[PDB]
Amino acid sequence: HMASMKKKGSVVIVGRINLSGDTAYAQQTRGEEGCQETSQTGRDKNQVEGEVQIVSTATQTFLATSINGVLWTVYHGAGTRTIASPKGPVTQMYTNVDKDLVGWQAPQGSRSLTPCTCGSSDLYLVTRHADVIPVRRRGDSRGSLLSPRPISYLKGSSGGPLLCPAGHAVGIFRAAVSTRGVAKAVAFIPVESLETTM
Ligand SMILES: COc1ccc2nc(C)c(O[C@@H]3C[C@H]4C(=O)N[C@]5(C(=O)NS(=O)(=O)C6(C)CC6)C[C@H]5/C=C\CCCCC[C@H](NC(=O)OC5(C)CC5)C(=O)N4C3)nc2c1
Numbered sequence: 519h520m521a522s523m524k525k526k527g528s529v530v531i532v533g534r535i536n537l538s539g540d541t542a543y544a545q546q547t548r549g550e551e552g553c554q555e556t557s558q559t560g561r562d563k564n565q566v567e568g569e570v571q572i573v574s575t576a577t578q579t580f581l582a583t584s585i586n587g588v589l590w591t592v593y594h595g596a597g598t599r600t601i602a603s604p605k606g607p608v609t610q611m612y613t614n615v616d617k618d619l620v621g622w623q624a625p626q627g628s629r630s631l632t633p634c635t636c637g638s639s640d641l642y643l644v645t646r647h648a649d650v651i652p653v654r655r656r657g658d659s660r661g662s663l664l665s666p667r668p669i670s671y672l673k674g675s676s677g678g679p680l681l682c683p684a685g686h687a688v689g690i691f692r693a694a695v696s697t698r699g700v701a702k703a704v705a706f707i708p709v710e711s712l713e714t715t716m
């Protein structure tokens with residue numbers, strides 16, 4: 519009934535992939551209880567750092583990546599949800615179900631990756647476990663893993679970046695192509711598709 523209608527909570531930043539130094543590692547910045555509370559209020563007073571955030575809703579967890587001042591992620595994770603911020607929920611500034619893409623203004627304190635213009639096909643996928651996985655680009659939106667592995671290892675990493683050797687953003691991880699549960703290839707939203715939507 520109209521009286522009891524609920525609203526979906528915000529996407530919440532719950533951690534980050536630290537790429538500051540020589541060793542990549544995940545950091546949690548908010549636990550599940552505080553995540554649920556922040557999703558309901560949409561008010562997140564935590565300091566944000568870095569390029570790759572770990573994000574969560576009430577039911578899903580995935581990644582979000584800042585490129586050119588926009589925090590980008592997948593529509594299949596975030597839907598049309600707002601993101602929590604220090605002054606309340608923030609509405610998406612980009613939404614494209616056809617590309618499986620959404621974006622919000624990048625949070626204060628984040629660092630943005632630069633869009634790649636190298637034209638290189640030797641890529642690196644960053645997962646939610648801070649694994650850096652070499653990927654050979656195979657098309658506009660596809661790459662093959664140099665070392666295949668079960669899809670379990672990639673689950674929860676949509677919204678993460680594919681980077682070039684120079685650390686530029688080449689695309690946003692969207693889907694994993696597997697055979698008998700082994701991921702052989704990935705699909706991603708190319709950064710040019712991001713740059714066009716901007
Ligand atoms: C609803 O509106 C939509 C609009 C556009 C759209 N466009 C898609 C391509 C899309 O594809 C969905 C979600 C993707 C996923 O699972 N994305 C990862 C991930 O990690 N998600 S996640 O866990 O973070 C999670 C669920 C958010 C919390 C990166 C995958 C890691 C493991 C694969 C597991 C088996 C799943 C393997 C599967 N292959 C696959 O479709 O291959 C093809 C044929 C090349 C496509 C896959 O990858 N997807 C299935 N859905 C939408 C939904």
Ligand SMILES: [Zn+2]
Binds near residue numbers: 634635638684685
């Ligand atoms: Zn580059």
